[PDB]
Amino acid sequence: GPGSEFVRRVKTIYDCQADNDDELTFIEGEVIIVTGEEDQEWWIGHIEGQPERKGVFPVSFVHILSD
């Protein structure tokens, strides 16, 4: 999962509207604090500094950010 691969924060690389009520909506260029794994294609997290914006999101829609 993201934890085991040392993923703590990521930046979004596309826009994304939730299709289900557990999915995070975001625009490109936002930072997500990654806090878990949904499945092999989806991680879970919240927007850095806006933790009420939270949910699952595609692994392929983000890129790892260094500390």
Binding site: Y14, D15, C16, E41, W42, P58, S60, F61
Partner: peptide, 13 residues
Amino acid sequence: GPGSEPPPKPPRS
């Protein structure tokens, strides 16, 4: 509906 065209998302499980 003028928004960007993001790539297909993976399916949910």
